[PDB]
Each structure stands twice: as structure tokens, then as C-alpha cells.
Amino acid sequence: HHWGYGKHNGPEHWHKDFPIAKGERQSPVDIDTHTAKYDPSLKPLSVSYDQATSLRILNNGHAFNVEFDDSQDKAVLKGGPLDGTYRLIQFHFHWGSLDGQGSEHTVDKKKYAAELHLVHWNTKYGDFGKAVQQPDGLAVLGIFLKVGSAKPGLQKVVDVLDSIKTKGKSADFTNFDPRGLLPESLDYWTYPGSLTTPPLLECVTWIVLKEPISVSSEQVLKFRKLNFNGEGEPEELMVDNWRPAQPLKNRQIKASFK
Template structure:
């Protein structure tokens, strides 16, 4: 999460940020279109207590689809909506796939292979500032996910303005490994372009929101936690032409 600007009226620029006077406590006050940030009852993120997760044997296998040139982990329901903007305003419009990370002091070879490629020195030094871009070839999304994993899901919101409550959150229940050095490299990245003051990517998460009466559902049977879960099924495609498995 970083900062952004939105137009709430002709010529009126409204800012939000992760910290300070434009931070989360004020999002719902500075723009009427963001009122859910203050009064919504299904806001994200939430504290996921494993003891509150309900096993749901009817959850379908997780299907992951990636494009050949770019990957977005915020998906919209194409059966109901024509674009991401429309989906963010409608019920069951968005799905956000979330992965957790474990940091260790071990050598780089023990880290996730996708992140190792993404965070090596040759790559990370090319994207130091906001809007920097670098194209990585032959990097498969499959490497990002554990060979076998379960997931937890709940109904929530965007974690940045306008905080629309149209999101199905999918939390992968096995964390990725990352080294302390790789995490340090991430913290050296700036949320701002080089023309502005440096602001680290660290410490920019929205505070936890009340779970209230929402259900946390999972597809891993607590009676057999070691049992391999169903899925994932990968559908890889380039320009709409399926290939792979």
C-alpha cells in the first residue's frame, strides 16, 4: 500500500496515504465516496485466528490464471462485470489472493525460487522508485506457490480507498520463505518517484479491522492437517491461447 490522489469534485484533489494526516483514520472523512473506510462492517484486513476458521469441505479447488506478459493478483469477475472499476462497485466483483512471508537469516538458497529471482540484486536495483519497471523473462507464477497448500477465505473489502466491500479474500495458509537480506532490499525501495522525498515500502499496511460476524472458511481438514489439499489447478495462457497444464 502506498499513497494516491483522487478527484472528488472538479479541480479538487483529495489525497490518501498509509500514515499521517491523510492516513487510514481519516480516509472516510476526506471524501464522501470513501465513507465505507469509516463505517463499513466488512472491512479488510482482519486478524485470522486459526481457532475461528471453519472447515468447509465444499470449497472448490483454487484455480490460478496468469497472462503471458503480466500478473495481477487482484482479479475481477468477468462473468458479471466488464472491467475492474465496475467490479469494485458490485457484489462478488473482486478476488484478492494474499500470501504470507517468513523471514529468516538463512542463505538465499532456502528462499522461495520466485522471490529469489524477483529480489536478486540485478533486478531489485532497477526498480528502486515508484513507476520504475523491469521486464523479467521466463518467470513462472507456479514457482510462487507451495507444492501443496490450503487456503482460508472470507468476505471483505479493498484495503485502500474507496474500501469497497466487494472482495473475496483468499489467504494461502503456507507462508513463503524469504531471507533477511531480501527483506532489507524491499525496505530500501521507495513509494515515491526520485523527485520526491524517500518513503520506504515498510510500515504501510492498513490497521486490522474488526471481523464482526463474518465467517473464516478453510479447505484444510483440521482432523487431517497433513493431508494434501485439493488444487491448485493452473491455467496458463498467452494472449488468451491456453497452454501448459
């Protein structure tokens, strides 16, 4: 009886195995655009993905992860609110059963159809397991997805999903360029928070871009054909794999833009 997103094991139950679920810096949060303060001391974000090496795509029973070689500084995030160099390890998404829900962060209570998380870890801690134990261990770049025009750079991901339909399935996934998933603007909000799934560790500097990307209805429909279950188990579609907004508590959300 492990955690997940159903009635009996979903977000409102997580605190029983993971007490930090009720902590002081949990994620996601609602971004109140009028209360966020412009911080003119925040630097432009530096996204350096030209040498990125994607390796594999994995259905882990909660989402699918596109994994990267993070054994060298090849795809890194710096600048913005960050001190130091953070290495891209994987990206994944959270999405809905309907286009009106699916994102984890909200903007003035608006839910997007999905949200992309590009996960990076602070190289001063040596590797990812060590980084998640530190309050500045990870930087997760969050990007909202709305349904409209297709995102051509997403299509290679959409088309391999039938090969990883069920939990524990993986596929080779080389040469995928995550630059094709970025909006034009890197204007962002930033605050200190947590992993949005167990173990819910409070180790994340969140950097959420204001500009959503558009994906097509057909692209998101293909996310919703994935399964939470393993092969040979009863079929339960992988939809609504999002945690709702958590209390902001004693935090301020900062804007890079006016």
C-alpha cells in the same frame, strides 16, 4: 494531502476521504483459527497459471505491481469458494520495516514479515473497473511471507526493484512465472471483504493460504529499499505499507481444511 501510510495520512485517516473505511465488510481481518469453521462443501482451489503473460512492474507510490495481460483467459483462479472464472491482473506485496510486522491479515494475532496479493477479477463483469463495483467482483489470493530460506522464484522480482525505486517508475517484466511464489499446500481460509487500500471497495472474496512461503532476509531487505516518493523528492522508504486488522462484524471465516 492524499492517502498513504504516514502519521498524517495513514489508515486511521482514510475514512475522511473514503467513508466505506468504516463499512461492514472491510479487510484485512484477524483470522482466529479456532473460530474459523471447516466447510466440507468448499472445493479445492484451481490455480491455472501455466499460460500467464507478465508485462511490466510498476512502483505506484504504495507498493509495486507486477502486471499481467488479462485480455484473455491465460492465468485464472477458479473453484474454492468462487463461482465462475477470475483472471489474474496483477500481484503486489505489503511488508514491514522489521521482520516482526508487514502482513495485513494476521493469524491468531500473529503478524508475518510480508503478504503477497494475487489480484483477480470476475470475467462475467468484462473488465477490472466494472468488477470492483460488484460484491463478487474480485478474488484476491493472499500468501504470507516469513523470513528464513530464500524463495528462488522471488529473486527475479527482487533484482529489478532498483530500476523502479521511486513512485511512477515502471520497467519491462516479461516471462515471470507466478507459480514460483506459491507454497506446496493450497489449504486456505476464505471470507468476504474489501480492497485493503483506498478506494476500500467491498468487492473481494478473500482466499488466504494457510502455508506461508519463506523468503530470505536479503530478499525482504531489498523491498525496504524502495521509495514511496517520486524521483527528486525527499526520500521516504517504502516500508510498513500495510493496513491493520479491521473489525470482523457480521462475518464468518471458513476453512477448506480440518
